[PDB]
Amino acid sequence: SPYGPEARAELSSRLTTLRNTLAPATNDPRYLQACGGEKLNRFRDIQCRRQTAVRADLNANYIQVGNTRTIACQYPLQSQLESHFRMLAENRTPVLAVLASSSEIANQRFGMPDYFRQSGTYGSITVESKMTQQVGLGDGIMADMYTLTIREAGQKTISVPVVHVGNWPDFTAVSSEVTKALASLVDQTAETKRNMYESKGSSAVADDSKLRPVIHCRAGVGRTAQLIGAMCMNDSRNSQLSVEDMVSQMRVQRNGIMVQKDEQLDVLIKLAEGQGRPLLNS
Amino acid sequence: SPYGPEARAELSSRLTTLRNTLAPATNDPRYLQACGGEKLNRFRDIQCRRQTAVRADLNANYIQVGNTRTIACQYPLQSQLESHFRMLAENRTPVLAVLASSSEIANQRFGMPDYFRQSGTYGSITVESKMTQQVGLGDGIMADMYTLTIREAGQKTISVPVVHVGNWPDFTAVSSEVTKALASLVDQTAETKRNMYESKGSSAVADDSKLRPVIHCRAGVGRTAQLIGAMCMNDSRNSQLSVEDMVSQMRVQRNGIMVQKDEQLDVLIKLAEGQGRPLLNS
Ligand SMILES: O=[N+]([O-])c1ccc(O)c(OS(=O)(=O)O)c1
Ligand SMILES: O=[N+]([O-])c1ccc(O)c(OS(=O)(=O)O)c1
Numbered sequence: 001s002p003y004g005p006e007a008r009a010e011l012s013s014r015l016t017t018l019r020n021t022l023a024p025a026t027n028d029p030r031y032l033q034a035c036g037g038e039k040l041n042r043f044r045d046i047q048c049r050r051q052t053a054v055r056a057d058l059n060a061n062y063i064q065v066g067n068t069r070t071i072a073c074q075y076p077l078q079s080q081l082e083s084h085f086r087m088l089a090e091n092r093t094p095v096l097a098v099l100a101s102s103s104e105i106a107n108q109r110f111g112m113p114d115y116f117r118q119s120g121t122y123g124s125i126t127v128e129s130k131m132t133q134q135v136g137l138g139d140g141i142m143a144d145m146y147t148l149t150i151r152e153a154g155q156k157t158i159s160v161p162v163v164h165v166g167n168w169p170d171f172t173a174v175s176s177e178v179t180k181a182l183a184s185l186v187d188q189t190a191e192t193k194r195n196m197y198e199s200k201g202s203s204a205v206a207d208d209s210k211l212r213p214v215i216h217c218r219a220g221v222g223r224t225a226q227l228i229g230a231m232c233m234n235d236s237r238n239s240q241l242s243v244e245d246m247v248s249q250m251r252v253q254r255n256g257i258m259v260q261k262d263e264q265l266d267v268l269i270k271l272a273e274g275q276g277r278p279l280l281n282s
Numbered sequence: 283s284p285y286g287p288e289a290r291a292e293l294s295s296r297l298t299t300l301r302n303t304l305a306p307a308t309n310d311p312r313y314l315q316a317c318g319g320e321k322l323n324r325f326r327d328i329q330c331r332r333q334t335a336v337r338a339d340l341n342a343n344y345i346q347v348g349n350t351r352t353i354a355c356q357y358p359l360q361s362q363l364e365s366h367f368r369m370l371a372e373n374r375t376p377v378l379a380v381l382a383s384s385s386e387i388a389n390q391r392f393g394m395p396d397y398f399r400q401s402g403t404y405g406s407i408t409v410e411s412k413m414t415q416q417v418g419l420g421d422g423i424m425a426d427m428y429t430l431t432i433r434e435a436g437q438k439t440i441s442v443p444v445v446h447v448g449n450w451p452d453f454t455a456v457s458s459e460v461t462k463a464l465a466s467l468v469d470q471t472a473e474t475k476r477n478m479y480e481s482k483g484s485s486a487v488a489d490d491s492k493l494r495p496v497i498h499c500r501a502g503v504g505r506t507a508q509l510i511g512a513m514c515m516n517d518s519r520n521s522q523l524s525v526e527d528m529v530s531q532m533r534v535q536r537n538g539i540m541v542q543k544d545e546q547l548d549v550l551i552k553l554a555e556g557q558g559r560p561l562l563n564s
Binding site for chain 1: 295296298299300303311312332333346348349490519520521522523526527530531534535563564
């Protein structure tokens with residue numbers, strides 16, 4: 001069977017080799033180094049591939065999986081909020097998906113600023129947050145939506161749709177079903193916003209680096225990778241892209257931890273199976 | 283005014299761009315293609331989004347607008363009736379809303395079989411039609427109700443409540459007041475039937491692809507989309523979902539013609555205004 005134990009063990013074997021190869025050495029030239037000064041990485045061992053880095057002072061990467069273009073990042077550190085908002089505004093972000101829970105954000109020990117549910121001033125940037133719809137995803141998991149309006153003197157004002165999975169559970173994986181519902185919602189939100197930009201003749205439409213959904217959880221490697229994998233499977237342009245391809249691509253373009261847990265890879269396996277998409281490359 | 287000429291012009295503009303982007307190319311990969319064979323699309327330019335298609339041999343789509351889950355389809359071709367009945371039964375359809383007029387049905391040149399007002403045999407499926415209540419909706423518009431009992435050897439017998447509005451003319455919008463009364467009746471009918479299935483511990487309750495109201499008119503883009511929009515505004519879970527959201531969601535999940543006529547979009551605007559719901563996204 002293409003989705004049996006033997007196939008799963010082979011997929012695991014190829015991915016483990018790749019994680020090992022991509023493990024960051026001290027002062028690794030493959031990875032962004034703090035430039036710095038200020039702490040760049042939220043976690044010491046969770047680093048940001050230099051050649052696909054979005055900004056020199058964020059832990060954030062452009063990732064293309066097949067045809068699917070995204071940005072994946074860590075939850076921005078306190079010091080990084082201005083730069084983070086500048087990334088969001090410059091990208092003409094069509095959806096920001098935050099997969100860290102309300103309980104994580106509320107936990108002062110974790111240093112995850114509640115930057116999208118309240119208004120605020122961050123250096124030369126001001127941000128206004130407004131609550132919009134709430135969408136159930138299944139299993140009682142809820143997406144709370146917002147718009148963030150980012151203002152800065154001498155810059156165009158940009159509003160960004162936010163999808164926040166406020167009760168992502170901390171003790172269990174989220175199911176493939178909830179994952180698929182979340183990828184659909186995030187993709188739909190992006191498509192509505194991207195359409196507005198296309199309608200106005202935005203020059204961002206022509207720029208490979210712009211109009212990318214931005215996805216973060218806490219480290220930007222576990223929950224983030226599970227959603228990015230599900231989004232690439234939702235994309236009609238990605239026929240025949242294997243699970244091995246998707247995960248290898250996320251790993252090379254961000255770090256070797258992308259899809260951090262077995263349960264996360266299992267979701268991607270189950271979604272692929274549902275589509276009759278291959279796990280392994282021939 | 284957020285409901286004035288300027289707002290409405292901007293809404294139309296965004297919706298037009300989307301329709302144009304969604305236009306099906308010859309052999310478009312975003313859309314379901316005829317599997318042979320028999321005609322799939324009742325109208326060659328009214329196509330069925332592949333990623334949300336219900337069955338490979340029907341022009342029919344799962345649509346979720348905010349939290350509201352439905353199925354929208356074209357009036358089934360004769361050769362599609364058997365598959366159409368199998369969709370209805372497998373979905374444990376809580377209500378089937380038919381918005382095609384008695385005149386259209388009667389017009390033999392339109393090829394719209396009278397599949398719900400009479401009993402019949404469709405391959406291995408037998409269907410028994412029984413008339414139930416009649417509910418007036420305003421402006422002399424009438425909802426005629428039925429119960430379709432679908433039987434097939436070795437399969438569970440399923441009964442489907444039908445709401446047929448036989449006097450909503452093709453290419454028109456009934457008033458916002460009639461639309462609101464029809465959405466209430468359709469939602470109420472589904473609620474009663476869904477309750478029955480829950481009382482019996484039906485497995486369909488847990489399944490997101492099942493228990494969806496099914497709505498069709500002739501093409502499944504005009505009158506259908508007006509009703510679906512009204513149903514989503516009747517759903518208490520959809521606070522702050524904009525008209526721009528609702529229509530963009532219907533378009534991405536079926537085709538770019540959803541909400542075919544200005545007058546239909548006008549009913550949705552008028553219903554939104556009545557609720558202080560936004561027309562546009564920020
Ligand atoms: O490795 N980590 O540093 C790490 C820490 C906490 C997380 O919750 C996590 O998972 S993640 O946020 O889904 O990527 C990853
Ligand atoms: O868009 N169309 O090409 C189309 C064709 C026939 C219809 O009868 C129609 O109207 S509809 O049945 O209310 O969707 C729409």
